[PDB]
């Protein structure tokens, strides 16, 4: 706290449009990570750093201007991933007391501010360049530090798109920065590549969050975001269906079935099935582009999930509202299957 404020002033400063580090910068960044790992139940550390606007005043300048210092750039990414964590995941559940509730809402206020700071083509430019380079390396020729940095970049993009909650202009600005930086092309590459199946859950979360404000029939152009953002999303969705959906949805489902222990969030799969099958159908694309989720096996899988959610809503009563939300996403996916099959007669 006094330690915390001394560490923050030992990062650097901006002389005009230029950021000057201090020689103990990498050290200070890592100290801030240690503080965040020892914070109380108030999440005081991330609240203090949020109040101080360290992410904006220091970390983003370091990221954009000093990205050739490899250990420091990696340290800053780690810190930003932790600082951009969804507020639900920081406090666990929603505070009912007027105390923790003021905290939760302060954490969320800082998340919303980080989301607007990231509205910048140079931030995403640096992330996309770095990701591009990391992926040029063959899959079995890059080190665990390389895969670990891929993972953190994807988690950071995920977290920034997630703000403020689970499944207007700020998100739109992020989408445009994703488009202008080329990160859109890296996401499509990752989705369509058998060799990058380890990243498929991360990529599906990012793609689903990119489309969160959108209506699939409207986007398909047979009847909110600015027109040039909607056109970019239409183009992205078209390419995604043409080249990526079957592969990505097949790999996600594989992870979901093989890694039950990890309690992956399978709501992104349910959300994506309903959105992208609705778009494919509205656009009159060929059925083959959604064949992976248009099958008896998919009916069975959605039915299994809907049964499980419904049973949990009735037995895990302390979380009944969360299970009801999951049940609603599964049901919407089932309705889209039924609507698609019913138009095949």
Author numbering: 7 to 173, 183 to 238, 333 to 454
Pull text from the paper.
Human Timeless is involved in replication fork stabilization, S-phase checkpoint activation and establishment of sister chromatid cohesion. In the cell, Timeless forms a constitutive heterodimeric complex with Tipin. Human Timeless is a large, multi-domain protein of 1208 amino acids. During DNA replication, the Timeless–Tipin complex is part of a larger functional assembly known as the replication pausing (or protection) complex (RPC) that includes Claspin and AND-1 (Mrc1 and Ctf4 in budding yeast, respectively).
In a systematic effort to identify regions of the protein that could be amenable to crystallization, we produced a construct of Timeless spanning residues 1–463, that was highly overexpressed and soluble in recombinant form. Inspection of the 2.2 Å structure revealed that a large segment of the protein construct, spanning residues 239–330, was not visible in the electron density map, presumably because of conformational disorder. Consequently, a new TimN construct was prepared carrying an internal deletion of residues 239–330, that crystallized more readily and yielded crystals diffracting to a higher resolution of 1.85 Å. Removal of residues 239–330 did not cause structural alterations in either the TimN crystal structure, or the solution shape of the Timeless–Tipin complex; small-angle X-ray scattering analysis showed a small but significant decrease in hydrodynamic radius for the complex missing Timeless residues 239–330, indicating that these amino acids are disordered in solution. The N-terminal domain of Timeless is an α-helical protein with an overall shape that is reminiscent of a horseshoe. Although it is not possible to assign TimN to one of the well-known classes of helical-repeat proteins such as the HEAT or ARM repeat families, TimN does contain six two-helix hairpins, with the N-terminal four hairpins containing an additional helix in the intervening segment between the first and the second helix of the hairpin. Surprisingly, TimN forms a dimer in solution and in the crystal; however, SEC multi-angle laser scattering (SEC-MALLS) experiments showed that full-length Timeless exists as a monomer in solution. It is likely therefore that the observed dimerization of recombinant TimN is an artifact of construct design. The peculiar shape of the TimN structure suggests that its concave surface might act as a site of protein–protein interactions.
